[PDB]
Amino acid sequence: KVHRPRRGSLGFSPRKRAKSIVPRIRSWPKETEVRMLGFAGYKAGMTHILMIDDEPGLTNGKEIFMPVTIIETPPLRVFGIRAYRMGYLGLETATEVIVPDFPLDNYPAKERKGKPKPKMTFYKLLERRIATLPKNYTQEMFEQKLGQLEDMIKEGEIVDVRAIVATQPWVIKLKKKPEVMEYAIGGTSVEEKFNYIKEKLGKELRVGEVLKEGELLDVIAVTKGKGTQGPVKRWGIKLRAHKDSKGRRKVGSIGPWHPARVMWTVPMAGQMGFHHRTELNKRLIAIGENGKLKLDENTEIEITPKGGFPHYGIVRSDFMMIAGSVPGAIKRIIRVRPAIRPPKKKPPVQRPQITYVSVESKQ
């Protein structure tokens, strides 16, 4: 008989709707330097640039076209510290401490006709995600809880520590409900990690402070949804003979006589898209500040194309320009981590030479 590879891959089954619209990171890289291992942003749109290639290959030193994706990256708020001990079958959280309520200043309040400014505060936007926050939680209580956690670390029951951070869509005026994420910290010593998280508890983190230009990353997000799709589109089966009187976009035979059952491997219709996916080795071309990209120390250009990004507003905060495309619809929350399985001859860790940036109307 004639052989051929099977239609589609079995390594992404079941092809079901993602458990949570907020992506989860299962594995983290091993880095000596002490820093947060990743960041979060919102997908804005796509554009292209012309750059002198510095990555190894045939096209080295020659100007090349390059598509890039824009992620708006408002600063994250570090508002929790969590500790992990070693359980019987794996890591188990031992304790977790969140900072007490503090006033919120970066809220873009508007003065409407009547009434004063809303005068928002933390624990008020966070309620939209948690809905059950501490009451009468004071600085002394927080200090004693931190001391207890530090004493536990000193005793040595703690094998890991991680940071609880929150997004701030309100500063960019996207929405108000924040997304809470848990991030591992690079390094080796739990004491160093604890000090690093503690010094930033209740404060802000910037992608400029976290990541490095020209480094490889992995992008995690939930892909665009397609609804129910037949096998032709879901798995890539071949259309049946044009003379078929019972349809063309269906599998011919769903199994032999024996086994007397339908094998799970037979392509079939179902959910397509909205899957949790990870893309490896995506280069971080640039990091821009306040929606502006600096080219030659005397030229700066607004990254927003004329008329704005389609189905998106205007980039007003820090942002990331990455090579290639990324999963997720527009405005999706995108997580990025340092390269987990990078190649051996990596590109230099520095911004490339960008000769042109496209800001023409993309609509």
Partner RNA sequence: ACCGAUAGCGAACUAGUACCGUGAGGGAAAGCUGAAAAGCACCCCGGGAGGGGGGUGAAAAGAGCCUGAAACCGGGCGGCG
Partner RNA sequence: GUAAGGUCCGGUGGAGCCGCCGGUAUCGCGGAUCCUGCCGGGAGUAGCAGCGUAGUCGGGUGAGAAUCCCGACCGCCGGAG
Partner RNA sequence: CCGACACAGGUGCCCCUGGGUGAGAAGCCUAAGGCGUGUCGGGGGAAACCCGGCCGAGGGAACUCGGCAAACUGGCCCCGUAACUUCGGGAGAAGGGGUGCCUGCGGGUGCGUAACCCGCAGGUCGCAGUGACUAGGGGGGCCCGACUGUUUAAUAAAAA
Partner RNA sequence: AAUAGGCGGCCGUCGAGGGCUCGGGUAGAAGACCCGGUUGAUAGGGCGGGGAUGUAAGCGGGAAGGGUCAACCGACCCGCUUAGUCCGCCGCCCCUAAUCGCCCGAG
Site membership for RNA, residue 1 (CB under 7 A): no
Site membership for RNA, residue 225 (CB under 7 A): yes
**Any residues with CB less than 8 A from the CB of 268 and at least 6 apart, and which?**
231, 234, 251, 254
Q: What is the DSSP letter of 144?
A: H
The 8 Å CB, 24+ separation contacts for 145-154 are: 145/95, 145/97, 146/81, 146/97, 146/198, 148/95, 149/81, 149/83, 149/95, 149/97, 149/194, 150/194, 152/83, 152/94, 152/95, 153/83, 153/190, 153/191, 153/194
**From the list 152, 180, 201, 269, which residue makes contact with RNA (rule: CB under 7 A)?**
269
**From the list 56, 57, 134, 236, which residue makes contact with RNA (rule: CB under 7 A)?**
134
43 neighbors 332 (Cβ within 8 angstroms): yes
In whole angstroms, the minimum distance from the beta carbon of 43 to RNA comes to: 8
- Residue 67 CA to residue 341 CA, distance in Å, equals 23
Site membership for RNA, residue 21 (CB under 7 A): yes
Site membership for RNA, residue 314 (CB under 7 A): yes
Site membership for RNA, residue 228 (CB under 7 A): yes
- Residue 281 CA to residue 218 CA, distance in Å, equals 6
In whole angstroms, the minimum distance from the beta carbon of 150 to RNA comes to: 15
In whole angstroms, the minimum distance from the beta carbon of 17 to RNA comes to: 7
Site membership for RNA, residue 150 (CB under 7 A): no
Site membership for RNA, residue 276 (CB under 7 A): no
**From the list 3, 4, 26, 135, which residue makes contact with RNA (rule: CB under 7 A)?**
135
Site membership for RNA, residue 249 (CB under 7 A): yes
- Residue 328 CA to residue 308 CA, distance in Å, equals 19
Site membership for RNA, residue 130 (CB under 7 A): yes
- Our CB check for RNA shows the closer of 46 and 174 to be 174
- Our CB check for RNA shows the closer of 137 and 346 to be 137
Site membership for RNA, residue 311 (CB under 7 A): yes
- Residue 167 CA to residue 177 CA, distance in Å, equals 9
- Residue 12 CA to residue 357 CA, distance in Å, equals 37
223 neighbors 327 (Cβ within 8 angstroms): yes
- Our CB check for RNA shows the closer of 35 and 129 to be 129
Site membership for RNA, residue 248 (CB under 7 A): yes
SS (H, E, C) 186-202: CCCCHHHHHHHHHHHCC
Site membership for RNA, residue 29 (CB under 7 A): no
Site for RNA in 82-121 (CB under 7 A): 82, 89, 92-96, 98, 109-110, 112-113, 115, 118, 120
* Alpha carbon distances (Å) from 225 to 33, 72, 192, 230, 341: 38, 21, 42, 14, 28
- Residue 324 CA to residue 298 CA, distance in Å, equals 27
Site membership for RNA, residue 16 (CB under 7 A): no
In whole angstroms, the minimum distance from the beta carbon of 67 to RNA comes to: 19
Stretch of 47-55, 62-70, 222-230, 285-293 contacting RNA, by CB under 7 A: 222-230
Site membership for RNA, residue 306 (CB under 7 A): yes
18 neighbors 12 (Cβ within 8 angstroms): no
| 357 token code pair | 């940036």
By CB under 7 A, how many residues form the interface with RNA? 72
* CA-only gyration radius of the chain, Å: 24
**From the list 34, 64, 159, 174, which residue makes contact with RNA (rule: CB under 7 A)?**
174
Site membership for RNA, residue 292 (CB under 7 A): no
- Our CB check for RNA shows the closer of 134 and 343 to be 134
In whole angstroms, the minimum distance from the beta carbon of 62 to RNA comes to: 28
